[PDB]
Design a protein around this ligand. Structure first.
Ligand code: CAC
Ligand code: CAC
Ligand code: CAC
Ligand code: CAC
Ligand code: CAC
Ligand code: CAC
Ligand code: CL
Ligand code: CL
Ligand code: CL
Ligand code: CL
Ligand code: CL
Ligand code: CL
Ligand code: CL
Ligand code: CL
Ligand code: CL
Ligand code: CL
Lengths: 331, 322, 320, 320, 322, 331
């Protein structure tokens, strides 16, 4: 908003747009799907006030950042190159990278592939899972039986786009609402991630009022982005899970040793469906400071619990600046 | 922005964004390349004050409107379907369509193919030329000599995009400035449209101050649209010239009989390079009220000469109403 | 008498056979037919005071057959008709189309009502452009079995079946859709292909129908043995493209005078009852909808005199 | 008299016109021609005691025209000829080919010498398969200008030129290669296309040649207005594939009795002098090589009686 | 190896590798899938001792022979051109061609298309069947039911490769073992050739000891070839069954008139699945000396029954020489 | 040969063949173009005798290693994953990687992307050049004017293969001979790397006797490999220079900090044409032990100077085990 400043920086893949606020060590924030730099609006002044230079990018394919045409231009190595060039373009040599949802694997792999640049890593909602042995799409395909796991539904180009483009604002509204903590029962919350043959993912989205974290003016911002960007850039992220599995094969099973932080929502499927990865943290994230679970919190962790995320981030950052268990938080 | 209202309407091709202002007969406004509904900001209050409902769309491929993946989804028949469905979605059965730059052939073919909907047509900068016998790319490739005509440069996917994406804001400012009336000499103006082999089109763009009609805040708006939309939807318009020439073959040499209006800039190549089209207006636009040439005006006619364009549109429109 | 002409068009060239003097009646044949399908109408129209011009549709006989599949989209057929009217020295015309020629004629009247000032539609009713993608509709019809229109979509698929014996395939198809040739049971299954089967596996065998002599079959088969069937089939392969191109006329009615003639034993008639029932709104200038008892698909050949009477009576009515 | 037949072949079907009784003489026309190019030979062969069968080559007239370009490779033409001999109830035949029919006949004799026991070659000499890729040779001929065979390689390119006016293009080509129609100067440039030009830009205009009446041109143009030119041109688009397929016969000679007839004013004759000079080794069973004075490319039509005499005299000689 | 000499000869399709031994009339040996010239190691000294020049090639796609990239470069006419040019490159005008497994149709069509070069033909394991009316893939797809016939499994590029590359040596050993006479019951033997959906062909391969004809050192040779060559050249042979059926249409139903010899294994599916082809030998191979069925012998006939195969070949060859 | 043992190991991209010899720390050797594991035959017993476990792989696309069909399966990240999986498959956690010619960028990038695995790196003939700003093929295209730089000549699939397949043994013989130290004058040596339009690269290869380092039996081994493998796998390496430039963008300008060693030949074009990269070593290889130039030595450094390479490698290794300038060596 105000105090925060928009920047356009050049990277090998092209233009990256970001909003930065504050002075001090660089904290690079990486949003998820289908989101925006604007998802960090609550973190930007808190990190700035706490003595940090926070920079929230638009991920490749999103908002005002470059959106290359080729699908493989959204492979993990491209996002990691995007982050590296942003740190350098901001005049820094190192940074803490914090990622949410798809920004979490982007942040983890940034820390994994360039540890001399990304010297600490925060992960929200999606735990770190090392590159594994099996092809992801063959895996997403076991799931569901009958119904198609939404990640498989997302693979075919133009398919999910056609569904979403029917009414972008409505589709975002349903998705934002549906994954908010407590918006759906566990049981419908789970059925939301599967698409019956011939159906649409949004057929199981709720239609009631916007959640408390999303005003109509906030939705105008989000829908205003995707009505302009389209969804292909965002969706191409999912369309590289196989390519990423090949590219990261040199880091098969590799741990992130740098200091790390995990914050997840108790009502977040991204957290509860990958509990095994989360429980492997003593081996996969040996430098983890702590794993925090926010009770009653859904998927949009840094907007559903902005003050709690702010508190945990800056406490963790400050601990690193002045130099295990699941910790569960109430409210 | 203050008076005008944003809307999203459904069309057979997907969502169309528009900004409308005023009450009365529908005047549909269609921007060109590389612009936005925002190019009509000075016309929306003027038409509204004159008793019209002005509706400025984002053309398919631009701003908040749908941007299909397929290059041929930007063929002329898609734009015309977009315009028709916009008139119907706004609750109207007829409308006047006014188009600038590429919006001009879009308005012309809207008037040509659906004369029962678009009952009068205004064309700015780009004259009406009926569908001809020659394949458009065969001509674009002929002129310029060793240098490549910019429309020909725009044909290959990703080529013009790669150039513009180097600096979307910078490219727009140069193009906006280069085509402003008097910003370049006529010689400099003419070669701006030709690309020497290995060169970039923007290599002949001027640098320095923005033209008077475009503030830095105006550039923030335009560049903010294209930093989100990309340039492919916009460029795909050029990539259908041969497809349109095929599609429009059933209206080969056909005139537009509706009442029509033409406004062009004396220093606009889009106007002065098609003098032959203007000379055929007595036959091709037999319902023409008048052809207006604005002396000293460049390409961005409704922003470079907003008051005279406003007056010409409303007086012409009122003329139809009596 | 009747005369062959080759006229220049934007897509290349249209071959046609014209007969008579007077207001121009452009005749547009269906699938898998020929200008020759109108042979009984050309002298009748000439005797009634009209200049009848029966084209070979793009892809057929002596007309241009471009290689690209989408060169057979509806807008191409319409430019073909427009250019033919102009090449014959006329400014307006009555267009009459049968089977696939019916939507070609209907869209000619719809897009250029200043040229096509009246329209005749045979066998296939007019349905305005709707919002559902045609191939999605053709899919989930049948189940299970593949609706023949879906069968026609894949390039080379129907061609490989027909080319086994162009003449035999033509005869079976002409025979199968003749009024009274099959039970309803047989008639309905003819339009569906079981997986791995051929469409013609359900074609009847035996004697040629009454409207088709052996010499008639020689003409038809002599054409397709030279042209092949791709141009004809590419017509079906543009239903989705057409649905996109015609979106600017979504739900639009045809307002100028129109005439419909269909067969009671024509599936094209009974499967599009809704379209026929919507005529008061979709064809408000409709003169009448005639359903000919016992008539199959090949209406202007199975009921040559009745079609001639209705057409010339309708035509005479317009200019009176 | 002469009779039309449709015979079944592995590639689909060959249409042909046969006349006479006796040993089978299969006639194979060139580009852009027809079975009809042999019209003066069919009665002559019948009167001399032979059953002459003039096919439409695959891609032409009423014969099958498969979609794939490589379905016009030389082995397909040879299976077509083999299947035709068998479909006509014969076990062996004499094959006589003109222009592109010459390599088709030559390779039929080469690959199935037990079926094709004698071979006639008109206009185009026999050259055994060599090791150089043909398209590489056609490239660096001319420079600078594009040899017409290279011009024929790209799909749609020659077709777009010809389809502007199939009849006019045919007439110009037939006229240009008629004996004496052009100066050497004009004749040589006809086979090269300057960049951006059309091959027919160097075709002569004016009266039809003496061998081609207006009614003759109606037949030819009536065929290609129905078939299009892709099947015919796909023949040229297989020179490289043929060069690969025929590698098992690299440098192989044709040993059974053979006959060559060429025109002195035929470029196909003068540009392949080396092939003609190598006949003692490449065609050791050669009866004679006849070069007809003043004759252009269309040898069996420009010199109908001389070709008839040489063929029947040669044929009578073999079985004596 | 000791007596035999390695050679590289030029052919129109590129380099062909072979190992030759002996002096006299040329006997060209053609291995099958997935083998090597090395499959003829027991025949090279025997033919040489009998007065013949035996030449065992690496088929195109195998070992040290050229392996073109294009799938259709493995069509039957390429193999025949390879064989012809090999005869000519070795300084001969004629030869006897003897082929095993896929080398059998290669030898048959070599004899069919160039009878002036290949004056007698031996066929092992795979009977001669003249080119028929039915598209080969239409048949392969019909049989097996819900399970997929292995030739049909081999059609898609990379599919069979991915399975085999999991463990080239292991796959070969299983296939070599599975088709050895008596290694499997006839029921197990038959389903080895069908792949249930989602399964791998090698899922039905036996494990355990190598067959008697193949030492570990022999497997090192075979696996060492395929670890370098890959399997695509070998599999591309199957990927041309429909192309060959088109290419060979000019020899539809044609018989091979040369003197011919057939040797097959009683427990070899390649032999027993084509009994109909064997029953037509009086018409299709009218120059057949005799059809030999080796009881208890499996697929790898010249290695499973080397002495009897050696005797049959040389006595047949000597029979031609008088 | 003997003492050395062949192994086949499984990697994410498939099978890697290698020959290993010795006991002690792992020294992974990576050959160049168009070579083989067999190029290290002289290093295998010397490293084994000096207390090291030397493992010479066949690079992806070569000899008995896997040769995937897709061209991009030869991107740098695949070679680096190949090396990582080989270290793990041999029961080790770290290794010294030593690469020659194309194995040198493979070894450097292995050390750059997985420094926790590859803890020291040796580079022969080809210096380390960080990922740069310009697209490689646009660069290879400036070169020559008229004549086509062989790297550009190598891009079109099937093009160089057709040339080489005309006579694989002859082509290797000419290339091996042509780049041997002192085999050609500087001037012809340079013209060898350019192809006039319509010509063949081998048209400028010498035809005399094999160089001293290559016996007829050695050439039988090399030609015996490529007559079986074909050249596409080897050439696809060159066909990924652009893809590599994208993939390594996250390491733009990045240095290798681990201990490094460079050995190059004085008569090696690979050394003299990239002198600028070699002279940037204080910044790009801050951990360089030394840069060694072997006088009179050509391209095939570890075969043209086997004892000198052995001596420099083991002295360097031993220095690391017990814990700037161009150094030029004579003979
Ligand atoms: C874990 As998600 C909602 O970005 O697919
Ligand atoms: C007609 As224009 C100069 O806007 O491309
Ligand atoms: C009703 As129909 C003969 O056009 O498929
Ligand atoms: C010599 As010709 C008519 O076949 O190009
Ligand atoms: C004929 As076979 C079993 O070797 O594919
Ligand atoms: C440096 As090199 C001979 O592998 O291209
Ligand atoms: Cl995109
Ligand atoms: Cl810090
Ligand atoms: Cl787009
Ligand atoms: Cl920028
Ligand atoms: Cl066609
Ligand atoms: Cl065709
Ligand atoms: Cl291969
Ligand atoms: Cl393995
Ligand atoms: Cl490969
Ligand atoms: Cl060490």
């Amino acid at each position: 908003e105000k105090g925060a400043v928009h920047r356009l920086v050049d990277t090998p893949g092209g233009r990256i747009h970001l909003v930065e606020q504050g002075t001090g060590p660089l904290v690079l924030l990486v949003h998820g799907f289908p989101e925006s730099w604007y998802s960090w609006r609550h973190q930007l002044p808190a990190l700035a006030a706490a003595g940090y230079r926070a920079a929230a990018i638009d991920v490749r394919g999103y908002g005002r950042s470059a959106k290359p045409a080729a699908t493989d231009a959204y492979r993990m190595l491209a996002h990691v190159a995007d982050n590296t060039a942003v740190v350098h373009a901001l005049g820094e040599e190192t940074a803490t990278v914090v990622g949410h949802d798809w920004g979490s694997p982007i942040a983890a792999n940034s820390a994994l592939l360039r540890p001399d640049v990304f010297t600490a890593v925060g992960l929200l909602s999606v735990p770190y899972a090392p590159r594994g042995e099996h092809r992801p799409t063959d895996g997403f395909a076991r799931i569901g039986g009958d119904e198609e796991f939404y990640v498989s539904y997302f693979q075919a180009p133009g398919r999910a786009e056609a569904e979403i483009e029917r009414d972008v604002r409505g589709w975002l509204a349903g998705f934002y609402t549906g994954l908010t903590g407590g918006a759906l029962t566990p049981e419908e919350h789970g059925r939301l991630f599967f698409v019956p043959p011939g159906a649409h993912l949004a057929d199981r989205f709720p239609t009631g009022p916007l959640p408390a974290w999303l005003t109509e003016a906030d939705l105008d911002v989000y829908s205003g982005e995707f009505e302009r960007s389209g969804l292909t850039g965002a969706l191409n992220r999912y369309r590289n899970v196989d390519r990423d599995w090949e590219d990261l094969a040199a880091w098969h099973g590799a741990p992130i040793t740098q200091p790390s932080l995990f914050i997840g929502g108790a009502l977040d499927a991204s957290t509860t469906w990958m509990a095994d990865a989360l429980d492997a943290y003593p081996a996969t994230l040996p430098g983890l400071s702590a794993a925090h679970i926010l009770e009653g919190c859904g998927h949009w962790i840094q907007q559903e619990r902005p003050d709690e995320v702010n508190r945990l981030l800056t406490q963790w950052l400050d601990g690193l600046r002045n130099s295990l268990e699941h910790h569960h938080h109430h409210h």
